Design a protein around this ligand. Structure first.
Ligand code: HEC
Length: 106
């Protein structure tokens, strides 16, 4: 899918996670965020179209999704451990970290 749709998937499932009351619902939303993040990693954003993949900006662009998946996997582990509240807290701090890549390249 394109970058804007993957970003909508990330933004929407973060809303799903903070409204959830069961671990299965949290794990499902994180699973879709993981797919959207790995798919967003292969795209080129409009303001970086003049750059090559090995440019510092594009290495940094792909690196941001590596760290996002890292936090998704940790939250997925918490959800698999039945820790709904802790998984939701991980998602809130993860949500805060979304802003940095937008400030650079959005
Ligand atoms: C870079 C490695 C990113 C990180 C991590 C996240 N986002 Fe992102 N996002 C990024 C860019 C370059 C853009 C602009 C795309 C464009 O075509 O202009 C976006 C956009 C969004 C949007 C708006 C989508 C739209 O229809 O305009 C949203 C709602 C969004 N991003 C959400 C979002 C969330 C919740 C993130 C943390 C899970 C997140 N993004 C990370 C680049 C990057």
């Amino acid at each position: 899918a394109d970058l804007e749709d993957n970003m909508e998937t990330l933004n929407d499932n973060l809303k799903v996670i903070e409204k959830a009351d069961n671990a299965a619902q949290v794990k499902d939303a994180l699973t879709k965020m993981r797919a959207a993040a790995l798919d967003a990693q292969k795209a080129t954003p409009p303001k970086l179209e003049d750059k090559s993949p090995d440019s510092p900006e594009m290495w940094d662009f792909r690196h941001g999704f590596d760290h996002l998946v890292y936090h998704i996997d940790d939250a997925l582990k918490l959800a698999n451990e039945g820790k709904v509240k802790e998984a939701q807290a991980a998602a809130e701090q993860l949500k805060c970290e979304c802003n940095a890549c937008h400030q650079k390249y959005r």
